[PDB]
RNA sequence: GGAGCGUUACGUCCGAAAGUCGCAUUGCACUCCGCGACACGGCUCUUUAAAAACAAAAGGA
RNA sequence: GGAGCGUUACGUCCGAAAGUCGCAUUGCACUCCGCGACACGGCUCUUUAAAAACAAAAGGA
């Protein structure tokens, strides 16, 4: 089920929005160009982040290489997104 | 009882709310009496015999008189102060 | 963005301001003349400090040498400071 | 044939900046040495025999060894510390009288 | 428990051995011939002593007679010696 | 059961102190003293007071 | 009313506005959005932001 966009959860919910975005960007940029990182602190979406890679190539490599990577004292759980993100489908 | 009416360097106060703690009491007495003269000492004990009462020692008898007459019946912690002269000199005053 | 001043954080927040300043001078003086050390225990400054050097050269060496240096049992994190405006703000 | 220096849970520090007040010196020493383990005392004096010198008394000997080895020559108030194991408890007392 | 040797403790540890031994001999000879007195200021024996009587009856008397006696400002605690192996072990 | 150990709250001083609640008290001191009541994990020893450690989810200031 | 002032509990530090704490939440989105809590005597000035004094019957470590 690969996809340009990986779904990360089990993230530390105490981290401020833009710090979290920066810290994810630094730790996932190696894998390729990141189009965007979507983070929301609502009840429904805290602890979660969508990283949008330019290439599925980068996303797949990011998923297994960083699966369980320790991040703000919690191992991050990474799957592919179940749909396409807006930017990837426009 | 007949209040002590001999002018004296020290005024004897009673009918004081004895729920107040020593240091608060002394400190609040010094605030409301400092404008009458130099105060040499304020004596407060919470023992059985001495609670509800305070001694305020002025350097000059005139200060005590004006203090007594101005502050008589003053509401102090919801009780009106009763102020007399001390029946005897305080020791710092007898020394002198 | 290198400049005269380093921003240190992950400092042990249970140390008194006067002692924390003298202890920081003790280890950072080797790098250059310290113009000032800014510490406060306010909610905005607690666990953080600014050290201001006469020369930018000193701040840069201080940053790289003392990165992670354990200090009051905590490895300190060092960055270049932002603008004087940002400093004045976090100190009020 | 050359013998290892005998470990001690107390380290002897010298080449210290003599311009620092003793009280501050103690607290600054604590700040850089507490990382190696529990400190029981730091010994400094204004007396003339203790000039530019200090003892840091650790609970465990392993602490003193790690502290000596890691901080040997560490620049402290613009002066590299010289660190060695303390010799004996009598010697510490004589130096502190 | 009746032994010809008694074990004393709560002795002041700053008295030097010979002195402690002769002082002990004076206050105990009156009960019977003392064959020997064992003192040492090692970790195992500082503050304590064994007194070796020729006869058990000498040691039973000294037990109760001299119990709690004040000695260099401290009350003596006297007991029978448990075993000859304990005595020899304490003195090694 | 009993006793010793007062180490610990930010981190100090206390815990035979202190604060609080309830009575009682209108009282002339210079030194201070009316009752009564109201917390504490754990360690050690066993009518003995020694030893060496130790908690803020347990009391005061 | 407004603004500035953070001095005070044993006696030290702290004392919101885009921040903090507590509880709940493992949730697949691309138009904000769970619930609860954040005390405080007084002083000074009058849209200025300065000045120099100050409380534990008022919050936190
Ligand atoms: N860890 C420690 O070092 C330590 C030390 C003391 C107390 N504590 C804690 O305190 C609790 C109670 O202390 P305790 O175990 O000593 O019990 P406790 O204080 O009741 O015992 C004290 C002893 O002194 C006597 N006593 C009682 N009141 C007295 C008074 N006003 N004046 C003189 N003597 C009096 C009692 O008869 C008792 O034998 C313990 O359970 C423990 O939690 C801990
Ligand atoms: N003596 C002094 O030097 C001094 C100085 C400052 C404060 N104080 C004390 O503090 C009290 C309050 O200080 P102030 O008058 O400067 O208060 P303030 O100007 O901080 O505002 C008062 C109240 O507004 C509330 N508040 C803050 N941010 C908020 C937000 N985003 N949304 C809703 N409410 C918010 C806070 O609860 C605060 O207590 C004073 O009455 C005084 O008792 C004393
Ligand atoms: Mg009032
Ligand atoms: Mg019990
Ligand atoms: Mg008990
Ligand atoms: Mg006790
Ligand atoms: Mg603490
Ligand atoms: Mg009592
Ligand atoms: Mg009680
Ligand atoms: Mg107990
Ligand atoms: Mg425990
Ligand atoms: Mg109580
Ligand atoms: Mg108090
Ligand atoms: Mg008005
Ligand atoms: Mg403040
Ligand atoms: Mg204190
Ligand atoms: Mg006070
Ligand atoms: Mg809104
Ligand atoms: Mg909210
Ligand atoms: Mg608060
Ligand atoms: Mg805290």
mmCIF file of C-alpha atoms (C1' of nucleotides) and ligand atoms in Angstrom, chain F residues 3-5 41-43, ligand 10:
data_model
loop_
_atom_site.group_PDB
_atom_site.id
_atom_site.type_symbol
_atom_site.label_atom_id
_atom_site.label_comp_id
_atom_site.label_asym_id
_atom_site.label_seq_id
_atom_site.Cartn_x
_atom_site.Cartn_y
_atom_site.Cartn_z
ATOM 1 C "C1'" A F 3 12.044 0.908 72.646
ATOM 2 C "C1'" G F 4 15.925 3.494 69.995
ATOM 3 C "C1'" C F 5 16.637 6.141 65.150
ATOM 4 C "C1'" G F 41 6.663 5.538 55.670
ATOM 5 C "C1'" G F 42 10.722 2.786 56.960
ATOM 6 C "C1'" C F 43 15.159 0.740 59.477
HETATM 7 MG MG1 LIG H 10 7.332 3.423 63.762
#
